[PDB]
Design a protein around this nucleic acid. Structure first.
Lengths: 79, 64, 50, 26, 96
RNA sequence: CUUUAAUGUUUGAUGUUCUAACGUUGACCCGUAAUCCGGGUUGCGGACAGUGUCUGGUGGGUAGUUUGACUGGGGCGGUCUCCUCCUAAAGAGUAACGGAGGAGCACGAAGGUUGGCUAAUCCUGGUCGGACAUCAGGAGGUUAGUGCAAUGGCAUAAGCCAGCUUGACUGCGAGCGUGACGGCGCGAGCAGGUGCGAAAGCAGGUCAUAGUGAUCCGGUGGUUCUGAAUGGAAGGGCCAUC
RNA sequence: AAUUCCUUGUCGGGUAAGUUCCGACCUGCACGAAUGGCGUAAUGAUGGCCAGGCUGUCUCCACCCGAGACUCAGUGAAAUUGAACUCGCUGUGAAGAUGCAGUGUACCCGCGGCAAGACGGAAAGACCCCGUGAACCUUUACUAUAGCUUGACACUGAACAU
RNA sequence: GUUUAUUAAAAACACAGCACUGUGCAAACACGAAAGUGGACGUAUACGGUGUGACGCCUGCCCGGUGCCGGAAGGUUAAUU
RNA sequence: AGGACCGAACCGACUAAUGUUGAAAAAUUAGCGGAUGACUUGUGGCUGGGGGUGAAAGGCCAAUCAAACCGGGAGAUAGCU
RNA sequence: UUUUGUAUAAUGGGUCAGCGACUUAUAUUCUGUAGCAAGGUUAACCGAAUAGGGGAGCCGAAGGGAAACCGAGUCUUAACU
């Protein structure tokens, strides 16, 4: 036995999403250990040190698909 | 007779212009070297007490 | 564990100091590096243990 | 008595067997 | 202030106190006064006889609380710039 | 300085004797037709003993208490915080003495940046040298690698090597995220000054998540803030910190 | 064996048959020499086992004599008690029914009786966990402490000596 | 012989005997802030405490652990200066 | 001669029967043990509640003892009923 | 009554009549109401006494800052866009 024990939250999930207001610098998609589950693309650079994403300007969130080998690349419609 | 202020509370709170109380942050007293600089820089400024805890400070300091 | 804690005194006459950590078992050499000094508002060399 | 505890019983059966290991070979 | 055996909110938070002592003896006036000072000359006292300040006090300040009309001679008080111009609007003397 | 002898001297230790302090539950006298007590004569003892204040040791002889929770009844065993995966039902979250495993750090470079680099494994040739050292060649395409457990990551490489380096900076920070709270997490940008690059631009620590401690109490360093009649000091504040 | 768990240890005696008894072996789970070892005539309202005698202990109860119980006269209580117009079986149900459903039986009420029930009456436990409950008791639980000792100064002096 | 009066009379307690150990007398010790008193109007053939428990044959080995006892060097040490 | 012997009064308490809202808040009936002694008893005396006393069971101290009875702190406190 | 749950075979009451459980004081906050309103208010006490006197004081009218200080601003900072 002794196989108990557990971690906790580490909330890691999309938050700012789709037609999100995308105000200023909200943490749209906060997934930990990311920079792979999603990527930079639009006016936002995102890329927190722990791969947290965030808007860099007001606008719609986008979720695209881009370069070779598919991938995700979150971006932002400008406004 | 007169209600007595919980003197520990008197030394840890101070009413402002609209019935708030503010309080100095925790984690600013020792073992500082292992903490990030940014954290400490965000702990120095005073901060107002939380909405959910305000009723306690209200109930502890009648003469606040 | 083993790794030590250390002061970083400014060469400048002001009393400012950074704080740091390093082993005694590993590298003997005492630290030398410049860093910004707020009282002087200028980068200046820092060294020393204790 | 029986009580229902597990270790409280296997000690007894252990004694009962441990004697038989001697008494057999003798 | 009790809340289970959890360490209480007025104990988690570090002390930052320091009474000034001096602060106890520095009351401040408002411009709506000294139309009532009577005699036309304000002082660290006088008002103290007008009971708009208190007895123990030494230092005092004017502060622009607003509305002064009749001329008044400020004297022996520290005063804010807005209050200074305010007393000037009354044509009030402002001596040190 | 020096090894230090001596007469000047300073105060100290034990040792002997002396008696006038002090003891006498030795003897006689009286108070007194009285074994208490006191005075008197006298024997012994003696500055020892005993009592006081302070002080080290010893002390269940006596006293006041403490001796955890979860718990498949309690005891015993076992765990108690922190990270990763499952259970967990395609938002988040979600329990069990449910299934697997880790941490109480490591590093001034394993940090910054500029330029450059491409793995394992397998096959054949080839000196000692072989199943497996280094070489060449071909397949193979990340089946490799990351300071460390496990997921998510990673070719613009976050993987490896080198040049120069201290941004592992100081003062703030629109916003959010996450919590009952105490808090924790992200972050453009701005101001100072600093490093790489020709320049664009990058850097407010490590690929990411574990590597931890509230308040009180104090110790150090800076600080005209306060300084109980004034002036200083004493602490106390304040920033930095153990 | 007052010690032996396994144990109804193995062998002998005693009994028609002996988990106890008496005798011996040693494989003494875990006897042992002043928290004494091994012996012991006498002594025991002591522990266990045997035998003669004797008996209603028993197979198996039987009859009789006295005091109660029973009937009559006079006094006359008690534990208990929500209220009752207070049945059996089968089943459901807070999970072991006089009360509910279904079914069966059952004219109204005493007296002597017997104790299966009314989770019958009597002790708000003698057991268990809990309570940051008390009590006492133990020790190398913590902090004190009476007492016993330690040294300084005080009551406390004089000469002399290395 | 004695014990749990009011569920336990014993294989418990006591005992003479043995041993250790303390105490030289103003004893050790005990009751007491102290005075005093018991010990005892007694004195090591006496008195306290502890263990064992007539008599008979006996009473093994270990002083590391714990206490007690005996040690004039040394290390460490409070009050005071 | 004797903590000798059998056994009444005298003290004791082993067995069984009753009794169990009893006659009795510990007794009766039939037996049993000690009975010249470490006996039995009348009368007064003293030891005091964290103390007494104890041929030691944690027993006994006014029908109650792992800390008596009465009064005071006292409306102790009670996360419990 | 207590429980997830009781005709429960879970606790409590034999019945009737009486007594029997959210108060008192000083503070503090909110609400309701009435008085005056940028001001509101008296406390001890004097007193022909529920009058009247008594503004010492309390509260509101300006805050920010640890603090000096500053003040419709202020603190933070060499400095705020």
């Amino acid at each position: 036995g002794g196989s108990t024990r557990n971690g906790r939250d580490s909330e890691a999930k999309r938050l700012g999403v789709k037609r999100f207001g995308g105000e200023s610098v909200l943490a749209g998609s906060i997934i930990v250990r990311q920079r792979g589950t999603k990527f930079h693309a639009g006016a936002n650079v995102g890329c927190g040190r722990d791969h947290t994403l965030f808007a860099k300007a007001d606008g719609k969130v986008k979720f695209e698909v881009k370069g070779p080998k598919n991938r995700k690349f979150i971006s932002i419609e400008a406004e | 007779p007169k209600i007595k202020t919980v003197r520990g509370a008197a030394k840890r709170f101070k009413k402002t212009g609209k019935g708030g109380f503010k309080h100095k942050h925790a984690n600013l007293r020792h073992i500082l070297t292992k903490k990030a600089t940014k954290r400490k820089r965000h702990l120095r400024p005073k901060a107002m007490v939380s909405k959910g805890d305000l009723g306690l400070v209200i109930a502890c300091l009648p003469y606040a | 564990g083993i790794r030590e804690k250390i002061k970083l005194v400014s060469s400048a006459g002001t009393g400012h100091f950074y704080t740091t950590t390093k082993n005694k078992r590993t590298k003997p050499e005492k630290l030398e590096l410049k860093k910004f000094d707020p009282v002087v508002r200028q980068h200046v060399i820092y060294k020393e243990a204790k | 008595c029986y009580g229902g505890d597990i270790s409280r019983k296997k000690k007894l059966l252990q004694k009962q067997k441990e004697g038989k290991k001697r008494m057999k070979q003798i | 202030g009790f809340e289970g055996g959890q360490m209480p909110l007025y104990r988690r938070l570090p002390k930052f106190g320091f009474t000034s002592r001096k602060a106890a003896i520095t009351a401040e006036i408002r411009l709506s006064d000294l139309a009532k000072v009577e005699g036309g000359v304000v002082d660290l006292n006088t008002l103290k006889a007008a009971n708009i300040i208190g007895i123990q006090i030494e230092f005092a300040k004017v502060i622009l609380a607003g509305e002064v009309t009749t001329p008044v001679t400020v004297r022996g008080l520290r005063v804010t710039k807005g209050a200074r111009a305010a007393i000037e609007a009354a044509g009030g003397k402002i001596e040190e």
